[PDB]
Design brief:
Helix content: 55-70%
Protein name: Fem-3 mRNA-binding factor 2
Oligomer: monomer
Strand order of the largest sheet: 1-2
CATH topology: Leucine-rich Repeat Variant
GO molecular function, one term: mRNA 3'-UTR binding
Keywords: Cytoplasm, Developmental protein, Differentiation, Repeat, RNA-binding, Sexual differentiation
Organism: Caenorhabditis elegans
Subcellular location: Cytoplasm; Cytoplasmic granule
Number of domains: 1
CATH superfamily: Leucine-rich Repeat Variant
Length: about 400
RNA sequence: UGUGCCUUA
């Protein structure tokens, strides 16, 4: 920083004024220095005269190159956010031009800014704070090619997409839903640590839940169609997503959410039914199988239970059956525990048994009896394992 | 006995 601003011992003076810095032409040196930016930060939160604001608008958000240099700076991005806020709060004759200029600067450099570790915060704060009509234009500047995938899977940029979804009406980012829904895009994005969160956030925003009751019916129709288009793609690749280290969370979200009931049923039919024994032995998909048991409609739950109890031919030599395999499997054991807990909850009154115009308690009692009988017969082997002891305890607790 | 992400002075 400028020598004029330094004391005898090479430190920034203590009685420095904002106007001195603004007048000096040296703001850019202060803004990228920890101590200097800290000073500016505090100074700009105070009372500002019209000319101080004017200078800040010109020097921080007035020229594209300096704006980008501050926005992409570890310290400067904070000053940029503060000045954007002041600009938005200052309804003088220059307001429209300043905001249009900011929209132009960001739009022209959208991809580069989104992927930047610091400028992404400038984008996010602009999306939620700018006049909505102008914030929509930033969304319009998002890329539509391979760069959009890069944005969705980026440790920093994914949060820009999530902000868009949070604060911008759907019509503006509907293209992102369609982009993500393309088979190859869905595969790449869902199978990524950050991308899978982006997709879950999108699904959440497209869900007709209590948080969307403020939408017009026209907007609900728009949402409904977008949700349907995305769910079709997810359902078409259900098998692949359910077994994946990251996308299994998406499938679980859908299965677990009552507001996505129709899609829950599709998924269970399309990839889980007839595959329960195999999927229950998978590290990732076993969690999906658990969610399906916990949330399936009673008619489908009955089919799932029947598949475990009766769906598979026992080993030709040993007579070991699906329940035998699952009970002692490293992942399958948790699915059987889930089945048991569900039945104990039902017969204990902790879980509603009426559905479809009938009380299914008789079914849960039947399933419970089968599990109780197996656990009784195999108690010695089961007691060797934590999972076995837990099932024995679950049944014991039910009695009393 | 079994999985993730929520990122800046």
């Amino acid at each position: 920083l400028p020598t004029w601003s330094l004391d005898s011992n090479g430190e920034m003076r203590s009685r420095l004024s904002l106007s001195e810095v603004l007048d000096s032409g040296d703001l850019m040196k202060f803004a990228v220095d920890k101590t200097g930016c800290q000073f500016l930060e505090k100074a700009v939160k105070g009372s500002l005269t019209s000319y101080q604001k004017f200078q800040l608008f010109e020097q921080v958000i007035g020229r594209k190159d300096d704006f980008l240099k501050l926005s992409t700076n570890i310290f400067g991005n904070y000053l940029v956010q503060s000045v954007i806020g002041i600009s938005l709060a200052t309804n003088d004759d220059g307001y429209t031009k300043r905001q249009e200029k900011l929209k132009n600067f960001i739009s022209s450099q959208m991809t580069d800014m989104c992927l930047d570790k610091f400028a992404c915060y400038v984008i996010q704060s602009s999306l939620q704070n700018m006049d909505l009509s102008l914030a929509c234009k930033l969304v319009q500047a998002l890329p539509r090619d391979a760069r959009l995938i890069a944005i969705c899977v980026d440790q920093n940029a994914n949060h820009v997409i999530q902000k868009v979804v949070a604060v911008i009406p759907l019509k503006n980012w509907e293209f992102i839903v369609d982009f993500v829904a393309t088979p190859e895009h869905l595969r790449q994005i869902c199978s990524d640590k950050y991308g899978c969160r982006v997709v879950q956030t999108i699904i959440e925003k497209l869900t007709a839940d209590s948080m969307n009751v403020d939408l017009t019916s026209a907007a609900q129709n728009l949402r409904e169609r977008a949700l349907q288009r995305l769910m079709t793609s997810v359902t078409n690749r259900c098998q692949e997503l359910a077994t994946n280290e990251y996308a299994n969370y998406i499938i679980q979200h859908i299965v677990s959410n009552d507001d996505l009931a129709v899609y829950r049923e599709c998924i269970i039919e399309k990839c889980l039914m007839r595959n329960l024994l195999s999927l229950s032995q998978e590290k990732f998909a076993s969690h999906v199988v658990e969610k399906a048991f916990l949330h399936a409609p009673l008619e489908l739950l009955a089919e799932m239970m029947d598949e475990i109890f009766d769906g598979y031919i026992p080993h030709p030599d040993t007579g070991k059956d699906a329940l035998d395999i699952m009970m002692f499997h490293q992942f399958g054991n948790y699915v059987v525990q889930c089945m048991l807990t569900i039945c104990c909850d039902a017969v204990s009154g902790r879980r509603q048994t009426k559905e479809g115009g009938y009380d299914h308690a008789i079914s849960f009692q039947d399933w419970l009896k089968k599990l109780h009988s197996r656990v009784t017969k195999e108690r010695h082997r089961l007691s060797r394992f934590s999972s076995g002891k837990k099932m024995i305890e679950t049944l014991a607790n039910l009695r009393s």
